């Protein structure tokens, strides 16, 4: 219920290529090829410079549209992000990366956030028997995560460890492919958690 | 100024007042319109705009504006009031919410539909 509809529409208005479909994104058919312009019948208009409100608005979209967590679901996350003691623009990224959408997706149990959100949402992916139908769970550091025992032999999970048959994901997590589980070890940093988002011009907009 | 004058005299409060004279701090208030004669606007614009002098329940009688593409009002009509101001009229500082049982909204209205108070336009 966070957003239902055209999702590759947001890439053409966003600019830089976004990964939110999986098999369509990594293939050369992500609709960024041959259609660079933003949607609508205006599209390739004159090269008008976006305003300084509009640039940080599109930066709100490059922090918000990919993660999918909405705005009223997002101001509170920035609020305890500012309440934590440290660099808030670096703690906030891993703080959103402590949720069962992108912890499970960075573990690779899904091909996109719309498979991690839904397959966690039905209640399959469990935290040690305590099955969670709810991707808003804050993942503790060092949490081991496995799929359901009935979900170990589905027609979609077998296509959801296919690319990650032993993929060397970065040091903010670990995984066991032959045990079909993982372990989110510690919170990810700013740069080695490499996603196309800028840090500096975000707290400036959210403090206004 | 000086600190002794700040102790003796003291700073003053700005004492702003209510721009709308509707009593009891009311966002909305029930009223009865009397005469719906028109008022000509100010210098830059000219339009035979719709304006009804509406007496309230708090003993007042004010000058109100009718928004939208026409209206459905009579002389003994119960007109709920909103407030605000109309810029290019000399006495009007009230608006009328279309959607109350004596002020129904104007048909063919589906863009500012909740603002002008009509239900969903039924498909055919």
């Amino acid at each position: 219920g966070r957003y239902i509809g055209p999702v590759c529409r947001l890439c053409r208005r966003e600019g830089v290529k976004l990964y939110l479909k999986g098999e369509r994104c990594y293939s050369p058919k992500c609709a960024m090829e041959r259609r660079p312009y933003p949607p609508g019948q205006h599209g390739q208009k004159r090269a008008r410079r976006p305003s300084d409100y509009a640039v940080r608005l599109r930066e709100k979209q490059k922090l918000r549209r990919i993660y999918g967590i909405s705005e009223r679901q997002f101001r509170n996350l920035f609020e305890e992000a500012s309440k934590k003691k440290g660099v808030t623009g670096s703690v906030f990224l891993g703080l959103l990366e402590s949720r069962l959408d992108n912890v499970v997706y960075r573990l690779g149990f899904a091909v996109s956030r719309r498979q991690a959100r839904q397959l966690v949402r039905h209640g399959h992916i469990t935290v040690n028997g305590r099955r969670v139908d709810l991707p808003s769970y804050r993942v503790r550091p060092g949490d081991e995560i496995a799929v359901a025992e009935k979900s170990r032999n589905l027609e979609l999970i077998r296509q959801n460890l296919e690319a990650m048959k032993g993929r060397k994901v970065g040091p903010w997590l670990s995984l066991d492919v032959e045990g079909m589980k993982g372990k989110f070890l510690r919170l990810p940093d700013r740069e080695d958690l490499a996603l196309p988002v800028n840090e500096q011009l975000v707290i400036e907009f959210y403090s206004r | 100024p000086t600190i002794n004058q700040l102790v003796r005299k003291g700073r003053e409060k700005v004492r702003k007042k209510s721009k709308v004279p509707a009593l009891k701090g009311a966002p909305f208030r029930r009223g009865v319109c009397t005469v719906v004669r028109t008022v000509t606007p100010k210098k830059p614009n000219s339009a035979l705009r719709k304006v009804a002098k509406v007496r309230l329940t708090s003993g007042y009688e004010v000058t109100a504006y009718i928004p939208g593409e026409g209206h459905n009002l009579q002389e003994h009509s119960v007109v709920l009031i909103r407030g605000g101001r109309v810029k290019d009229l000399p006495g009007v500082r009230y608006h009328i919410v279309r959607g109350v049982y004596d002020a129904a909204g104007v048909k063919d209205r589906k863009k500012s539909r909740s603002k002008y108070g009509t239900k969903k336009p039924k498909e055919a």
């Binding site: 300084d52 440290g86 660099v87 808030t88 623009g89 670096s90 500096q200 011009l201 707290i203 400036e204 403090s207 | -």
Partner: protein, 150 residues
Amino acid sequence: DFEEKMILIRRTARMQAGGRRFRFGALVVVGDRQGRVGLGFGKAPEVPLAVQKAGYYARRNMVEVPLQNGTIPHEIEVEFGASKIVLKPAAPGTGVIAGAVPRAILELAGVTDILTKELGSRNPINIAYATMEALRQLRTKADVERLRKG
């Protein structure tokens, strides 16, 4: 190898007999994100000369911004006419909180975190000259220690 972002375009006018003319004055902020920053105010009747001439007017001056922990070293209160710009330091990762013109200058000089506020007037020319006058007062600890040798 600078960035050279123009931020203000003003259309001025003077009265000639029969019909008033035009003179375009832009406002170009130039920088390279490593402390070098310049300001230019041009005079040209048409727009790309108003941006280019103010560009070279931003290029023939240069002032170095000292950067301690990626940001400005100390707070300042500077009055340029009626505009009273006040800058303050911040923690790392706090944010570049500024008005329109320090939002248009400090992101060209390269300040990571700034908490500033002006008082009095709202003229962007006086906030610009108040900003370029303001950052010249920025000193580190070392250039005060080697100044104070008593």
